[PDB]
């Protein structure tokens, strides 16, 4: 019952795409940002790229079909919807898994800071990254090809809720110390932006599964299209936190302009 002009979706998508392109090109063009913990921040950039590209393309297609220009063999629209609605179910499980991997790597380097170079090497990190993306690819397709059911929604709910518990545990550990003072402060922000942005949408579908026909909930979901602009704003914020908290990445950006 509320609407948002498509220009918002398109602009946010393009801007976040440019930011993530800059992050990945900066990592590759540099020779010191090749540590295995700095590749997970590239995999996260890829996940946010997926969200932005899919949303921009879906908006373009909806606006094109709405206008008086083509006819699209109804099966075909229902097919590209599932293509587009499936590079967001992948770029959610991938984001969750990558945040877990970053947190586990930081915990290993903070509490086991003796053989981190022996155990967590560059090649092993690459193997973990490719395994995570391969697994999340299947996870995000099985769900969307089987979305008519009710188990997928509740499974997503428990995934988000459990990762919320992990964030809370990490925070309560942050205030009781007994490298660490400044180590896990990044993954504390990156886990506090993902939750702040994917939370309004996520309880939106604990409601429709609990209180569909109820005059309170009904006027809650009625603002659905503005819980999706928040999902983009997680992808326009994440690359900024890397810039304002990692030093040598900033100096690389200076090389980008000159």
């Amino acid at each position: 019952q509320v609407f948002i002009k498509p220009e918002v979706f398109l602009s946010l998508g393009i801007v976040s795409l440019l930011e993530n392109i800059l992050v990945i090109l900066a990592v590759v063009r540099n020779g010191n940002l090749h540590s295995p913990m700095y590749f997970f921040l590239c995999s996260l950039a890829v996940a946010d790229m997926l969200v932005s590209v899919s949303n921009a393309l879906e908006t373009i297609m909806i606006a094109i079909v709405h206008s008086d220009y083509l006819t699209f063999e109804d099966q075909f629209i229902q097919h590209m919807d599932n293509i587009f609605d499936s590079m967001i179910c992948i770029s959610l499980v991938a984001s969750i898994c990558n945040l877990l991997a970053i947190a586990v790597d930081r915990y290993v380097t903070i509490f086991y800071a003796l053989r981190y170079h022996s155990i967590m090497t560059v090649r092993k990190a690459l193997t973990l990254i490719v395994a995570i993306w391969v697994c999340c690819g299947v996870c995000g397709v099985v769900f969307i090809v089987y979305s008519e059911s009710k188990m997928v929604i509740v499974c997503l709910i428990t995934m988000f809720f459990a990762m919320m518990l992990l964030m809370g545990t990490l925070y309560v550990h942050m205030f009781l110390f007994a490298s660490c003072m400044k180590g896990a402060v990044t993954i504390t922000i990156l886990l506090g932006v993902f939750i702040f942005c994917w939370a309004p949408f996520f309880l939106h579908l604990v409601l429709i599964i609990t209180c569909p026909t109820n005059p309170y909930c009904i006027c809650y979901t009625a603002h659905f299209n503005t819980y999706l602009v928040l999902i983009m704003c997680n992808s326009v914020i994440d690359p900024l936190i890397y810039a304002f908290r990692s030093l040598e990445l900033r100096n690389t950006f200076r090389e980008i302009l000159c």
């Binding site: 879906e58 079909v65 229902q78 590209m80 659905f224 999706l228």
Partner: peptide, 7 residues
């Protein structure tokens, strides 16, 4: 089609 899913 429509934006997001489970709207």
């Amino acid at each position: 089609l429509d934006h997001x899913r489970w709207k």
